[model samples]
Target chain A: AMKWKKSLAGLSREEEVMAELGLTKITKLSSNENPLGTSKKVAAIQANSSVETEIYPASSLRKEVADFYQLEEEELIFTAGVDELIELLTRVLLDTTTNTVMATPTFVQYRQNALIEGAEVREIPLLQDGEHDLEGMLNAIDEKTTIVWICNPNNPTGNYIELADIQAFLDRVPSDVLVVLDEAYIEYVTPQPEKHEKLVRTYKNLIITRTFSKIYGLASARVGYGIADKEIIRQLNIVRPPFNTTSIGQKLAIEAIKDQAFIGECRTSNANGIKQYEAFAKRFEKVKLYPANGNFVLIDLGIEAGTIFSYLEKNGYITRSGAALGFPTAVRITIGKEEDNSAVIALLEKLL
Target chain B: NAMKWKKSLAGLSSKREEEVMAELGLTKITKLSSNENPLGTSKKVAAIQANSSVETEIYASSLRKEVADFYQLEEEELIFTAGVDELIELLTRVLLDTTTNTVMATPTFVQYRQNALIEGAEVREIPLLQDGEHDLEGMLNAIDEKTTIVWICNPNNPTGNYIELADIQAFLDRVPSDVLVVLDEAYIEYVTPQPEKHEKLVRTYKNLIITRTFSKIYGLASARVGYGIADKEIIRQLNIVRPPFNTTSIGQKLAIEAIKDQAFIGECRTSNANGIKQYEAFAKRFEKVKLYPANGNFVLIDLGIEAGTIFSYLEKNGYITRSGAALGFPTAVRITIGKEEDNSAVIALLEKLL
Candidate 1:
């Protein structure tokens, strides 16, 4: 029982500890997000919007966004945040009594959303190496399953199911099942790995999702999109809110896409952070560092990760603890600025 | 045809001149969003959020984020933004497969969550507690086997009942693993005599979902912003299922600033507390005041007489309060706690009417 201490959050937990430590402003490395600030072009365009209504892009905004990704506008629908899109996808597809399969330890919302709709959630645990076990995902599927969720460069794990592995798995998968390929952090990957965008054109049942949050540094702006068949997009649009994406968010996202150079710089800096992390990772004997293809690195500490997270917290740093996602022995820290990375590594060396 | 035309939104196909005529009423809107902070954003943060650059920022500035860790949560487990309304829509659409899915809800918070039904959720309506608190155990006991989603509006709208956290914890434990509990805290900041923050529970239960918004306390009601916190895996799935862009740069800035203004929160807390106390005192004078105790921005006044007439009278006097008749509180009205003068004027108007 001590190996995995049941989380005390649900217990009658008091804020006495938080009260004791007066709030201190510190460099945050908890979320695996872009450390660089907003892109220059995206920022400039958003700043230029003077009128409130003008901040909402014209109908042409959808077309322009579609054109950027070489997809038909009818195949793409913009929303305020990827969270809304996920809910809409589930709402339009699953009835409360249905069931859906999701890779375990990937993202929880797929199961939560399915469960919320009363759909049975069949959680498929990931492979030992922390990658989606495509065979397990396929074996779990049956006629009762309506959707299969896969997060590329999966959150907290930082591992991507290769394209070859998914294509092979899709061949065995039933034709009626909807495969959701979540590529939120794909942009930060090195050598620009092939995204699931191409899969949308060929796979009738596949839906490709990407967000401006991770690499684009627009998490606050809250913009995400789904690329699927036109029919699927149209059906989900019925569930879409009239102004789901704020006028300002729409304008800023459209402008953000215009800045290829800013995207390159973000990609470069994250690569640099990853490189620095890799160099520092060599010194740790107790912690096993997972290979990262995304902006963040996942470290499996050979100790109780909860205590490590707490220790890090007191030192004016924040990081994602992985005990809840079935990884009780590891913590996921985002790649941040050079000095922040140095300080974070120093803390890890001292604590681990 | 006019009603149908308005509903279709296809009225745009009509000639430009016809469009102008149709929009005449829109030129001056009667915003009965009495639910919003009608006073709008604070003058200080409002100016900062209104800066031209606020709209332009491509990435949500890390400097501007309300640290998810400060809440003892991972970034993946939280969707930081404005308004609980948007999260409701997200959860509904992602979970309910239109034709077959259904959600069981106790009405009277806001109908926007129910609006997901228009897309395909089969909504099962449950009545509020007769005295006006949520019947949590009763609701769990009565939920049909087919229902997957259960919603609770703490300090429920129009009812003003502050739900106990223990009750929620018990209800959640009994609910099926596949069933989700949306513990909405839209009015949480208002209902703070108790130290129960729903976000604290989200990290514990895998299926527990909680939502909060900046509209209530930030006074940025004009610009909608809200967020949902849940298990990281669920949040990641929500990330995949959500719309590409949910929050505006300006809205995000306003929210970040609002969260930091502890002084403003302190002022709002004291002001509303005093206002509710005065209201309770004033109500005691009436021969009958079925005023329910609530921890929210508004008070539920159950005047012995019909509330519709009172509503009209109040509206006539340019004092607006949300009618509770729709919420099964027929003789009651939901009066927002406002500045001192507004509170006194409402009392004066109520006395004259009674």
Candidate 2:
């Protein structure tokens, strides 16, 4: 009812969705979630952890998280999800006078949160290979640029940047501008890090956000954390809601991180699924596939995304259409288990 | 019920109480610090939480529709949050900034001030009256052209003192229409002669937003369920900044169950009143303590002893409370009206100490 910030419009979504199209056998590859389902250990915790809102949860899970990341407790800040972490940084750094730089077709929340905060957003388009135009992003950063978002193994496009490339980009960026490395899919990548542990300390302005929702298979628990300079973490802490992550979420995460062996198994299976998809894509002369590094792949079917999505949906597979993600003739399908992945590829072969 | 429970992560949002108990080597302890419902939530509410196996991936849409149906408000008039804590942060981030300011009562809820300051907004805290009442006049006058929000913590925290409905209505009538007035009725379920008119006030006023929590009487604090009802435009604006999956499926189901079981709600309401009497009788007999006419599930008693001494003594005796020193009244103690046994134990300890 009242006037709001000048750099803002508003969000009003009308009622949506068509009635059931007779396909009750829907499998979720649309949302990039853990296809293996919750871990047995984590599931057992939720089973016995009755709703006990009477007793307050101890919010100090930093000791365990700090040990895993090899950072001081002060350098980490946990949030409800990476979404909250993004929201906190937008509020802390962006305003009407400030601007943020991020790649186009990156995580929408990065742009959404910045726009809502009334900050100018500079969107650099992806290169021909679907990789981030880091050079263009560097050129886009003026003194007014307060934040630059780098999505390692970026979403929607499935492109990834290695540590050496990211470090090179970080070297040229101004020290005053905060650089957010959204590594939500870092665990899903075939390649991994200890170089990651060293990068946060190398750049004082770098803040890396990681989520259990992706690799830990605890999407519902809503836990994400940011690793950055202690001072940067402290600033975002003021914006983080006390009790942002529920207590049960913390318990689930502690257990989730404990099972690195389970995580290794999930990663190995995912890598195999990606390899299978790459082999299948070789048969399609018209299809263009981005390099599969993360747990999902973006493929240009050379047909309208709607038709591609409909064929998949009718066959009990519901993958995200490139139409919704700034790609007109492409689809982003999460790399699932071998059976599901093979099933979708066979369905695509039939479409040809 | 096979349903997962969400426990309230209240007070300092840390494990201070857990630390205290662990250090003391006490297995059984009386916890009355966070003003949570002593009675566990309705079995139906907790049970309604389905098997957490699959529904965890689903968003909280059904809960939204159900809450709208129960409240008899348009779907656009409500916004759900992690809790009242997130609601405060959401609003301040949406509206407050370096040029704007907020008007609120001093020594009331700290989130309003902290959130505004986080956004670099100027904070103007109108002091409470000697009797622990918000000086409505002071808050009204504190509003300026640059003031975007005024926080009214109905049944103010820490002191547990409340303002009348008429006073609120009158304040709304005079305050500038430009400023958003947030009425935090987190303890509304415990208030006697409840401010039934506040719901109607929200519908009638465009700038008014009234927040309620499931943590207190509903016993879903850990579930992290909370909502704020406002005019459709205000809600629409806030929804733009709201997180994608703010509430969990378990929380949505439990909150729905909590709403359906009013029988349980009424029982807690009555118990809260009776527990207040339990404290009142003790305060009346022991002339050294002065108690506020608390309208929430907890009471702040002005005992004639150092708050630390009383707090430490109670802690040593296997009981915990919020001392007035921390809550801004160094000679008083704030205790939640727990179950009969817990309340009696605390009363007995105080009686013997005197």
Candidate 3:
């Protein structure tokens, strides 16, 4: 038997827990997937998609995505998801001699991938407001630091560090060190086209990862892409396996990117849902909502989070327990449709 | 700047050749470059694929259970890869180190050796016998304490040859317990009516990994699904390196439907056998051509002239064939068994060119 790292153990699959719970109609707000379900336009595309899974997917998909974004094809790389891109970047950049820096309680994958490479990981704690501690992360970086990951509108916490703060952090960091800005939830927040696009073009060390899963409502399809300098993309291509993304994913993502109206609708509805939840939470003394920019709200429960989490599950709702996400007294709940939002709010009002 | 060990060069297609062909008024490109089924995907699978829920693209849990049951293997003993390519990459990461090495026949599937080198592991290449058969004794002799994997691309690519059951049994007995013997059976569906060789070996050898794909007879290459059967313990370790959700939702759904229709696979296999026989008879008409036996859906022929000249001529006519120059044979071409008319078209071109 092969010896895997100790860190790879004790990881339970998400579905296994839900299967054991055996509830068919539980509101799934745990994974941060689009609660609006798949877009009608994308669903139509899938229904009509005549992709021949027989032959290898055309290499032209890379060109299509590159053209869509107006980036040179050499500057973009497609992955199964941004998750795979994170792993690929880690594989390409980190080795035993290297170390990586990231914010604590951000995306856990950055740390997981770094540890798989046996690289030392320096996780600086997030600020009390759920923003990345940019100054502490910069201070933590040393000569051995090869990569720094910043999860914009961070997962579980649902708060974003401003683009101006990110720009300042980039200016202070060493030019040679790589910084990955994972913007998985960027569409749910403000679209800083000028700011993010400028950073991608100007900073050679900056790589931005975006997904069609969240706002585009194609989470099950597994499509994500990364933008970086041509040099970094070339290195990633060297590590990417042939036919990494499915043909269905590539087809639907192209359609999803074109349907900006659907994304806008989802964004507006999500904002309204968040607002409704915020309005309801203000009525309760025991629950507090964190500053929110993404599609989800991170709620701090003054009581034991486990009790509240179990109580919600028993009442036909699913949520991410704070203990699982490095927060002891909070829960990360995805913003659902108005009906879902109302149902969840009613349940919490009665329980809390 | 980051330092990447110059591992391997990706072979790029010549765009100028395609451009010239387009200018030559060729509107159709008959792709036999990769061994895809000439018969298109099954209607059964296409229907299931069309009906797949756009909303339920969550992680594939129920489908995995269905596949495990179909294979008669425990769930833990199997893992789905995007393709066999991903599994090869994962196995390389798990077993290979600087000190450990791997053994594979040269001019087999290139990815086996390519993935090994990417991990900074030493690759010991054993040459195949002149008849396109693996030299089992040579591989056995090459094994040392450092060997972590030995790749056997069964019904091997390019050459389209397979190792007989008795020969493989002998080879497995001599292999050390620590060394993983990977039998990549991407072309096994074409070898039907034979005994269930893979299931037997998987049960007997703790280190043997049997990998099969939906890309071959199932006609779903773009779907990208492959599975490996190994000891539960070995598979558990492999799972540690595998990224969850490697297989796409559509891919898993299509594969489940494809695997159930073994009748379709059997029909295609019969047609493929006839196509191979037709190619063999055509080769007999040429003075400098020689044919080799294979259990796969393709046939290999050694032609006297440089294979690139033949390849380019065929490309001009919208037919693509694998050139032998890359396979270390200067005058060979591997031809996929297409439909009857498509095969006849290839033969007519050979007649004109020769």
Candidate 4:
């Protein structure tokens, strides 16, 4: 008889393309996880770990991560992943009286959590180029706006804004209103020029979240962080649960970040893989590919997304269809290893 | 800026025993602060820890299916959270807000209050009876049209007092149909005399939700796994606020194997009672001390003197016990039942502290 505060809806999980199809070996290009798999160092860390039960986990990976990003220890906070931080920010800031602004058709979680908090979610349509409409977001932010999210190298579109673009938007937005710059895929960006440390130094309200689930290849470990001004980090800490990350996750994350050579290889491999994806866009005029700087490329195939998605799934390949993510005719493909890249490209050429 | 936010968000934090050890300059420490299983983890469970090549990136649907099968419940009737703590956070988010109120026993789980306050919900803290049992009549009286949730920490923490099933059902029968009664059975596995009552109650009560955690007796605290079971409708409603991949894949695997080895879990429950007897004997020596009847993995001894006085003396001697000041019992200390040697060592230290 008890009614919920809101008529909340549970999420329907993504279709089990592999299990339902009875395929044993499927190359999943969904979720844009690191294509090279988890790092060797992270694998070894778990293999050799005591698994540390009975005790709450410790942190100075806060220190280690801060040193890696050249920020003070107080300037960063860790979560299970960037996924949990979005939930925390919603609880800490948003309410029924407030409003939040973010780009439409970007990461679904920004809008998903905003809706749950019963806040007015003002979604600015992305520019024709699949980039955030910053001026529109600024226009949408009245005094009631509590937060604005900018998913850099936005999801489902794979387009990223340069540093000047981010700074220009930050300057025009109210500093009192928190701006969350979700850089979850920043590690895989090609010709990566955004200095997030410099960006955080300039803005007091901006909290930039990224994850080891990307190029670090610790997606299974569920570790990620947000870097900001110490005050912003301190306020977020008021809502952060202690030991949000697992001990195994923290140990794996610290060790994974140490092997920059391996990360560099993955980055180079990803950039190379993206090149193969870019070539398909160049060869066809109707492909309508946006910027593909990050590990994934979003190309409007001029066909129903599920048509190619089913074609790829039938060939032991899995991809995220833009149908669910607001692009009805686009498919977002994660750049996999060299062979899988060629295999997918070869498959795509069959239709194009 | 941002209207200086909603609340101060101030709450007490208990330092880890390792921090206490460094402060006391003790080289080695005996940790009994939290109610962890003292019988150590099983070989089969630890073996999963070594299988590092296991895909950590996948969803936990496989594990969920196995648990659903084992529990004899529908797959939709359960949810696995990072811990019961996360479940409580999500529950309060979906159920409580400024327009509603929540009711729970005073001196219950701290998180119940912490989360409810975070949502700015009005809270009715009904005082427990003198012997540390929940005052069900008072809690029922406290409920109104605004009350959406009521918490009962079964085989309760800090005091380790338990309520019988008949009384629990009677209270459940009286609660308003629209109000959800959350039974946190974190310590339920340790109760020796309890029957298969809670699982049956879940079927009978539409407004009931029960939480079970691997952090306590399951010896998987660091692994961070727990679950909530309710009617399919309740589980479906609460699942909306839960993060989809909150639990790690490793945690899912570990808890599945941990639950499979019931022999190890049963062995610790018996060993826990054996250790509680040691503390009961220790309390007998102090004339004014009252050791509450315990049905779980810990014991609560109410002393005449301030609990911090004895807590400090125990800490200085390299044993860690939770002081009851933060737990709403300023003159009591709760000691987790451990292995025989730990119980003996702490008792000997207690004999001298007096």
Full candidate order by DockQ, most accurate first: 4, 2, 3, 1
How many residue pairs clash in model 2?
10
Clashing residue pair totals per candidate (backbone < 3 A): 50, 10, 4, 0
* Model 3 regions more than 4 Å off: A3-26, A38-43, A50-70, A190-194, A246-248, A285-288, A302-307, B1-24, B46-71, B248-250, B325-330
**CA lDDT, every model vs. true structure:** 0.67, 0.80, 0.77, 0.80
Tell me the tens digit of each residue's lDDT in model 4 across A95-164. Answer: 7778999998889888777777667889999999988999999999988898999998789788889988
> What DockQ was computed for model 1?
0.06
On a 0 to 100 scale, what is the lDDT of residue B23 in model 1? 45
lDDT of 2: 0.80
lDDT of 4 by residue, B225-315 (tens): 8789888888877766777667655677788888888888888888887888777777777766688889888888777668899788788
How does each model score on TM-score? 0.59, 0.91, 0.89, 0.94
TM-score of chain B of each: 0.83, 0.91, 0.91, 0.93
lDDT of 1 by residue, B1-354 (tens): 000001212211111122433445233222232555544455666667555354333224442246474466666778754357667766655554344334444656555444545435456566666677776766677655556677887767766677778878888888776777777777777666746555768767777778877777667643566778788766766665454344555566566766776677767777788778888878888867777886887888888767788777676556556777755566878888887777887888777756
Q: On residues A79-181, what C-alpha lDDT tens digit does candidate 3 reach at each position?
A: 8788889977876666556789998898778877777666788888888777789989999988888899999888878888878888999999887889999
Cα error, candidate 4, residue B353 (Å): 2.9
Task: Give Cα distance to truth, residue A110, candidate 1, Å.
Answer: 1.9
TM-scores of chain A, one for each prediction: 0.88, 0.94, 0.91, 0.93
Model 3 interface DockQ? 0.29
- Model 1, range A1-352, lDDT digits (tens) per residue? 0011011111110133345566455656766557776777776765575533332224656877887888778888777667667776665555544677887787666665565555667778877778887877788887677788888878878887678887887777776788888888888777786645767667777888888777877775668889988756755665555455555666677777777788888888888887887887787666777777777778887767797788777776677787855678888888888788788888888865
Better of 1 and 2 by TM-score: 2
Off by over 4 Å in 1: A1-25, A45-60, B1-222, B225-354
Q: What RMSD value applies to candidate 4?
A: 2.6
